[PDB]
Design a protein around this ligand. Structure first.
Ligand SMILES: [Mn+2]
Lengths: 595, 370, 279, 136
């Protein structure tokens, strides 16, 4: 019958207009809020939704995360298109009226200009298609393929004044920058508060809003229980827009109490995830009859429990919809590192798939059984590092390295699709990157479908100090630096040891024994055994993944030398590099001195 | 009579072209800088004005302020009263000096046999795809922000539908071959370098050693140059010289080659681009500005388009050329080169007139289609 | 605008920090060209070194190099510096303490750069270098070659690549080419020069920090060998003639030594500057 | 001088093949000192006297020292299997016969320079290879 498929807005463009963490949250929750408002009338009516699976728990205000995606497919009844058009216009009118409210800072802006800006900027594209099929498995791709080509139509605000302080024709940037409103004060016998905009009221609830989010250090330094925001806010109010001043005040009061300040309290983690082999799982569900509503239900349960996991750990969720995840967490909180959070979210996704996809799991044979899996990209950067660059780094990690899209794009842009080479696409990977406040970049990639990921997690958990060490010398950290230096210096001899098959384990143990004398002072005990085990596991996984791929890559005459060198990954060197990156992460968390 | 010149630009080093997140304009995003492949046409205009002033020794605004009583009018008749301004986008003339018309910047490959120059254009976003509609009043309708248009049907011209995962047309630059269009990947034409620099001296004793910046420097592949056509009023010859074109002191070598008198540079650019003309779409070759994008949408069935952001440096003849430059208070969004406008069954003239309504931008090198 | 070629002739070991993602044995690497992967100096380093040397004459610095950072008024520079490319390098021999090594590809790139930039003394230098290159290619005939021109240096063994040098009597080396390329010169294939200038054959120095008699840190440093030669291009934007002449005279005087790179307090990167002498 | 990976692999193969490491992955502690002593002897006395002294076994010359020269022979043989023609360079490549002692070969047609280079690289490779076993 009649099916209506809706797509909403340029999301990447709005995201890349954000410079801080609260701005990024505003950018994502704007589109979550807009989608919720648009689909509210049809959810209130008993409308069968095929793609999103709107549920009552979705509407309830979770933490400030947005659970409403950009694409919706629902069965249409007569008169639906006119109502959708009118409601889209009315939702834009309401949002424009909310932007111009005097509760937000700045001069009084006219509602009509903001409405025209939103109309020219926000994409609200919907399509009515007559499909002679009820089945969701044919309905969803049929509408999605048309949505994909629909999205290529570009709408923009033609003119954008950004310099004059009273002719600011940039209203989404204004909204994201001033999403926390203003500060109001009594006769000094009161506490600072943020008025908050409509987004903050809708996301965190109008009532019982404990505290809004302003600067990165609150998330990153949520360990010392100093109540950074209230102290900084009373400093900035006693001074005499507020984002940079409160950021600087939070920095000053963080430096003031250096007795518990670890260097990673000024570093933030960006976590991005995407579902791997979910399309193949949908195809296998199409073959072995089982409706897509079970996969949607598993995704929704994973979203809710992942929000709870991210909130329980020190951190803030931004977008949790389906397979896509975007959260900001500190590197550590209460002795838990961000890698424990990644493990917990992988476990939540796998457990939810197991829970709700029992029918497909037990119906299908173990031979093919693709199943979905979560690929993660983690970026750790200085809090003053530009957000645009850190976001691009996280996107590169996830797409190119975690999803192995570098291989696919390099082959496809040269028309070497070559299903033989499509057989070599790697899945279920973890991509990591650390940038210190010096320009040093450490990155690694790891497969989560093996014992190497488990060994990595336990190695991190073993040698991460849950309590800051109050010793002015830190002998163990100099031992760790010596181990790091001797790993990076003897990399070729380690490669020779690894390339040997039968007796590589004992050779590794003996080499570490001979190179390091009295390799146990305090703290790190048995670190060498764990390092050698992890290195061997990584080498075996790398041999499984990359060897035949490298051999086939070198034999392809179409690829140039530069592209071939980019695509080729050395197994032993990658394993040694992974060990090096893990040790650098341990050193970064443990060492008190920064830079 | 008006002289017609072909202006070839060869990069003598790595070059940079400003964007919006430049080295020091904003907030804590002002130590990473990225570069645009092409300069704005205002950069070309200002280059021509600077070269014209230097040729006549009229360069002024030295590191001190002076007055120019009897050379204000020579300056005005040589370069014009003011820089390229988008406020005067509808005027019938450039409002400048001997400069009459500048063709859009072109990418030219010079084979090392002085045989011919191959001009590379952005790949049209519809290349290799067949886009068809159902003009009937039947079902399968689309709504672009409330405007009803027929649904597009995109198939490869090799009944498989459009795959968004197999789309890479935005990464390619095209040139005429023998019967097919040679496609060059954009990463072959341009190479990127990230330079990390510091300030050695540490001032004021505060926290320092973080004063490191990153710049993306672009280089053209060997035997690749930039070029554009210029028409000069009367007899104001342009001398070959070493010039600057934006960025952190980017140096180019200007070669001035004369073309025949009875020639139109617009016609020459269109002749070069003639190999990409399909009579169901409008190919946007140079960046295009329209005051109302909604009316243009109403005059078409589907735009396979992108956006670029435009901002100028606004200086008068008397402006303080040494200091903080005054940039346009408003940024403008232009349709990217390679965008295709799929017009209705009988309204190609309408969209053409809408695009040509800005003759100032047309003379600058904008709103050029085929 | 008069483009001028300046030769460097480093008097000590040169370390110019690359700053790019380093993962190998050597902790501190030197700057290398993106395209050729030969050692080079960024024009930023050249400008910084020359501005630091001339910083005591404020007016000259303001005129030529521009305004210091964090200054209220910003003045453009009038001299454009181009990156310094390695011309010749000392390689170790057995008959002589060292030989000055240049590759045929380095020579051809120098010829192309002089033709492109139009250096002041470019005509005669280009002619003589082209004749030298053509004679060398005729003598080699597509084979690996190691050509010395002094009959005494015949039979010299380059150490790292066990190549024995040969002396073709047909090839004349002009005195000014000898001045430009150095003394005790050997012209190799670019494969040999790339081997000799790669990370494995460039000098690596060990450093450590001693705290109370025991080493706290340890790292390895890559340095460009002493007596290496690099050429760069300088373009004067018709700057004031007197400041330009003072700058050029100070740059070309024998008493002037420029420090480029790191480790200034331990004498790294101390170099002279030589203009292109008329042929 | 810089050791390649291939020479270290040759040293591992030769060390295992010439019966120096037992099946328990242990080597007698005297052999590291024997390698160092061979290097010092080559420096102080010369290649030929050092080879002659280290190759003999008739007396109680520790009854294991000739194994070092056996390993050096194996390494030099392996290095001269490859890098064979390489006409652009000045080296002579041949297989030193099993029945010919190293001292006999250098006495006959050693040329004392290529052999000096091969001997020093082989000794360094032996040290690096022994770094990956344990002392008894
Ligand atoms: Mn996804």
């Amino acid at each position: 019958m009649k099916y209506i498929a809706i797509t909403l807005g340029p999301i990447t463009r709005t995201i890349e207009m954000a410079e801080s963490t609260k701005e990024l949250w505003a950018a994502s929750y704007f589109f979550s809020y807009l989608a919720k408002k648009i689909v509210e009338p049809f959810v209130k009516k008993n409308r069968t939704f095929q793609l999103p699976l709107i549920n009552e728990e979705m509407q309830k205000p979770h933490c400030g995360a947005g659970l409403f995606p950009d694409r919706y497919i629902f069965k249409s009844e007569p008169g639906d298109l006119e109502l959708l058009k009118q409601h889209s216009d009315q939702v834009l009118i309401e949002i424009a009226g909310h932007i111009a409210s005097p509760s937000l800072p700045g001069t009084a802006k006219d509602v009509s200009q903001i409405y025209h800006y939103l109309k020219s900027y926000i994409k609200i594209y919907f399509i009515e298609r007559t499909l002679e099929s009820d089945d969701p498995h044919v309905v969803i791709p049929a509408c999605e393929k048309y949505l994909n080509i629909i999205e290529n139509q570009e709408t923009f605000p033609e003119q954008e004044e950004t310099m004059i302080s009273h002719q600011k024709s940039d209203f989404l940037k204004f909204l994201i920058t001033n999403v926390n409103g203003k500060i109001y004060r009594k006769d000094k016998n009161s506490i600072p508060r943020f008025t908050g905009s409509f987004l903050t009221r809708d996301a965190f609830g109008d009532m019982n809003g404990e505290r809004l989010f302003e600067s990165i250090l609150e998330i990153s330094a949520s360990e010392l229980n100093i109540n950074i925001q209230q102290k900084a806010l009373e400093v900035i109010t006693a001074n005499e827009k507020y984002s940079d001043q409160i950021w600087d005040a939070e920095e000053i009061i963080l430096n003031d109490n250096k007795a518990q300040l670890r260097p990673y309290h000024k570093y933030i983690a960006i976590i991005k995830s995407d579902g791997d082999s979910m399309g193949e799982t949908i195809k296998s569900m199409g073959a072995y009859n089982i409706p897509i509503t079970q996969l949607s239900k598993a995704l929704l349960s994973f979203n809710i429990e992942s929000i709870n996991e991210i909130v329980a750990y020190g951190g803030k969720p931004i977008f949790i919809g389906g397979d896509d995840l975007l959260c900001f967490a500190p590197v550590c909180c209460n002795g838990n590192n961000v890698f424990n959070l990644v493990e917990k979210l992988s476990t939540c996704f796998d457990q939810c798939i197991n829970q709700h996809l029992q029918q497909y799991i037990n119906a299908c044979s173990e031979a093919q059984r693709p199943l979905p899996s979560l690929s993660f990209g983690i970026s750790i950067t200085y809090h003053k590092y530009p957000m645009f660059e850190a976001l691009h780094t996280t996107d590169y990690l996830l797409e190119m390295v975690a999803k192995d899209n570098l291989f696919k794009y390099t082959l496809s842009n040269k028309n070497i699709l070559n299903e033989n080479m499509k057989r070599f696409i790697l899945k279920n990977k973890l991509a990591f990157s650390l940038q210190k406040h010096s320009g040093q970049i450490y990155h690694t990639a790891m497969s989560k479908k093996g014992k190497s990921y488990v060994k990595f997690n336990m190695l991190l958990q073993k040698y991460i100090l849950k309590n800051k060490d109050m010793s002015k010398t830190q002998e163990s950290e100099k031992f760790l630096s010596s181990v790091i230096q001797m790993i990076r210096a003897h990399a070729e001899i380690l490669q020779i040891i690894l390339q040997n098959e039968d007796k590589r384990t004992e050779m590794l143990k003996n080499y570490f024994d001979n190179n390091f004398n009295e390799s146990c002072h305090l703290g790190y005990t048995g670190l060498f055994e764990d390092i050698q085990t992890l290195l061997c596991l990584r080498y075996q996984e790398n041999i499984q993944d990359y060897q035949n791929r490298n051999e086939i890559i070198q034999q392809n005459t179409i690829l140039t030398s530069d592209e071939k060198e980019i695509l080729i990954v050395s197994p032993a060197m990658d394993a040694i590099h992974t060990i090096f990156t893990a040790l650098q992460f341990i050193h970064f968390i443990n060492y008190n001195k920064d830079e | 009579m008006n002289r017609h010149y072909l202006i070839t630009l060869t990069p003598m080093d790595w070059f940079f072209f400003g964007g919006e997140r430049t080295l020091d304009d904003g907030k804590s995003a002002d130590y990473i800088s990225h570069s645009n492949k092409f300069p704005q046409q205002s950069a070309l205009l200002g280059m021509i004005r600077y070269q014209l002033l230097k040729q006549h020794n009229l360069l002024s605004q030295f590191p001190y302020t002076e007055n120019k009583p009897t050379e204000k009018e020579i300056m005005k008749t040589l370069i014009g009263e003011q820089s390229f301004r988008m406020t005067e986008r509808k005027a019938k003339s450039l409002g400048l000096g001997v400069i009459k018309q500048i063709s859009p910047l072109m990418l030219i490959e010079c084979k090392d046999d002085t045989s011919s120059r191959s001009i590379y254009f952005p790949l049209p976003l519809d290349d290799g795809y067949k886009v068809s509609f159902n003009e009937t009043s039947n079902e399968d309708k689309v709504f672009y922000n409330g405007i009803e248009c027929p649904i597009p049907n995109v198939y490869p011209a090799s009944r498989k539908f459009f795959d968004h995962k197999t789309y890479n047309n935005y990464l390619f630059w095209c040139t005429q071959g023998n019967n097919q269009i040679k496609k060059l990947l954009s990463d072959e034409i341009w190479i990127s370098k990230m330079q990390i620099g510091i300030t050695k001296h540490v001032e004021e004793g505060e926290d320092n050693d973080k004063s490191f910046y990153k710049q993306e420097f672009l280089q053209l592949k060997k035997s690749f140059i930039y070029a554009f056509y210029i028409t000069l009023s009367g007899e104001s010859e342009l001398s070959s010289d070493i010039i600057q074109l934006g960025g952190q002191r980017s140096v180019f070598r200007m070669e001035v080659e004369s073309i025949e008198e009875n020639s139109d540079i617009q016609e020459k650019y269109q002749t070069a681009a003639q190999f990409l003309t399909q009579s169901d779409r409008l190919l946007i070759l140079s960046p295009t500005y329209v005051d109302n994008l909604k009316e243009l949408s109403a005059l078409c069935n589907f735009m396979w388009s992108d956006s670029i952001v435009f901002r100028n440096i606004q200086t008068t003849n008397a402006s303080n050329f040494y200091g903080k430059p005054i940039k346009s208070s408003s940024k403008y969004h232009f349709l990217k080169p390679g965008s295709v406008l799929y017009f209705k069954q009988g309204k190609r003239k309408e969209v053409e007139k809408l695009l040509m309504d800005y003759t100032y931008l047309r003379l600058s090198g904008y709103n050029i289609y085929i | 605008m008069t483009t001028r070629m300046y030769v460097i002739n480093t008097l000590s070991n040169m370390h110019v920090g690359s700053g790019e993602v380093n993962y190998g044995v050597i902790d501190n690497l030197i700057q290398r060209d993106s395209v050729t992967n030969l050692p080079n100096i960024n024009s930023s380093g050249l400008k910084g070194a020359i501005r630091e040397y001339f910083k005591e004459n404020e007016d000259l610095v303001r005129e030529l190099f521009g305004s210091a950072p964090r200054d209220e008024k910003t003045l453009p520079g009038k001299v454009r510096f181009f990156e310094a490319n390695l011309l010749s390098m000392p390689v170790r021999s057995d008959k002589v303490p060292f030989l000055m090594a240049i590759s045929d590809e380095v020579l051809q790139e120098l010829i192309t750069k002089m033709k492109f930039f139009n250096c002041e003394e470019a005509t005669q230098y280009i002619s003589h270098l082209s004749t030298l290159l053509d004679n060398i290619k005729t003598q080699a005939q597509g084979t690996d070659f190691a050509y010395v021109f002094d009959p005494l240096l015949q039979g010299a063994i380059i150490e790292e690549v066990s190549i024995r040098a040969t002396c073709p009597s047909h090839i004349p080396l002009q005195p000014s080419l000898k001045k430009l390329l150095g003394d005790r010169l050997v012209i190799l294939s670019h494969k040999y020069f790339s081997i000799l200038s790669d990370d494995n054959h460039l000098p690596v120095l060990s450093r450590n920090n001693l705290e109370n008699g025991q080493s706290a840190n340890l790292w390895y440093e890559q340095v460009l060998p002493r007596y290496s030669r690099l050429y760069f291009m300088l373009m004067d934007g018709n700057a004031q003639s007197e400041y330009l002449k003072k700058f050029r005279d100070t740059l070309c005087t024998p008493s002037t030594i420029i420090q480029i790179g790191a480790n200034a307090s331990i004498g790294y990167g101390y170099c002279q500057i030589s203009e292109l002498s008329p042929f | 001088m810089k050791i390649s990976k291939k020479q270290i692999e040759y040293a591992i193969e030769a060390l295992r093949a010439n019966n120096i490491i037992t099946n328990d992955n242990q080597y007698p502690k005297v052999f590291k000192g024997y390698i160092s002593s061979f290097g010092a002897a080559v420096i102080q006395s010369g290649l030929i006297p050092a080879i002659i002294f280290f190759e003999n076994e008739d007396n109680d010359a520790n009854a294991d020292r000739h194994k070092i020269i056996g390993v050096l022979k194996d390494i030099i043989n392996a290095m001269r299997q490859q890098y064979t023609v390489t006409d652009a360079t000045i080296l002579v490549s041949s297989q030193i016969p099993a029945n010919y002692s190293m001292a006999q070969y250098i006495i006959e047609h050693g040329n004392t320079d290529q052999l000096l280079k091969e001997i020093t690289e082989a000794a360094v490779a032996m040290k690096l290879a022994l770094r990956m076993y344990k002392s008894e």
